[PDB]
Amino acid sequence: PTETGVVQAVKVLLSELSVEGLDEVRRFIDALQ
Amino acid sequence: PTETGVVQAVKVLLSELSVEGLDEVRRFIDAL
Amino acid sequence: PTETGVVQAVKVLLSELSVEGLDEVRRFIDAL
Amino acid sequence: PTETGVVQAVKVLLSELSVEGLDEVRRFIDALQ
């Protein structure tokens, strides 16, 4: 698997989510760096 | 989430997998 | 990305789909 | 599809990505709100 493809899939999934879900994902990303 | 978007994202992910991974996903679909 | 993680994520997504969506994903696997 | 399941899948995918990919995803999330 390539990062480019995974990023594209993640964008598709995120684009439909509510603010609640987006806020949860952002907190998780901030834990990864 | 809509089914259309999730299906689209899954297809993008599957296009990156090896035959082994594709076979594992196919078996899981059979479990559902 | 590792195949193991992507496969795991795909399974989580597939557990949410209807039969119609699962059938579409299965057909796509056949295309790969 | 439920948001909870999609969020869980997104977390699995993000957890493996490089800083480059994570940075791209974050910019995208900020566009969704």
Residue numbers in the entry:
A (entry chain B), D (entry chain B): 259 to 291
B (entry chain A), C (entry chain A): 259 to 290
What does the paper say about this structure?
Cilia and flagella-associated protein 410 (CFAP410) localizes at the basal body of cilia/flagella and plays essential roles in ciliogenesis, neuronal development and DNA damage repair. CFAP410 is a bimodular protein comprising two folded domains, i.e. NTD and CTD, which are connected through a variable unstructured loop. All these three crystal structures show a similar homotetrameric arrangement, with each monomer consisting of two α helices that form an open nutcracker-like conformation. Two CTDs first form an intercalated homodimer, and two such dimers further assemble into a tetramer by packing head-to-head through their first helices.
The CTD truncations that finally generated well-diffracting crystals were fragments covering residues 256–295, 212–246 and 213–246 of H. sapiens, T. brucei and C. reinhardtii CFAP410 proteins, respectively. However, those of TbCFAP410 and CrCFAP410 only partially dissolved in the buffer. We, therefore, carried out refolding for the insoluble polypeptides using the following protocol. The final condition for crystallizing the TbCFAP410-CTD contained 2.0 M (NH4)2SO4 and 5% (v/v) iso-propanol (4°C). The crystal structure of TbCFAP410-CTD was determined de novo using ARCIMBOLDO. Our in vivo data showed that TbCFAP410 localizes to both the basal body and the posterior cell tip. We observed that the A267E mutant that breaks the tetramer into two dimers could still localize to the posterior cell tip, but failed to target to the basal body. However, the disease-causing mutant L272P of TbCFAP410 completely lost its localization to both the posterior cell tip and the basal body. It suggests that targeting TbCFAP410 to the basal body requires the tetrameric assembly of the CTD. Therefore, we conclude that the localization of TbCFAP410 to the basal body and the posterior cell tip requires the CTD and its ability to oligomerize.
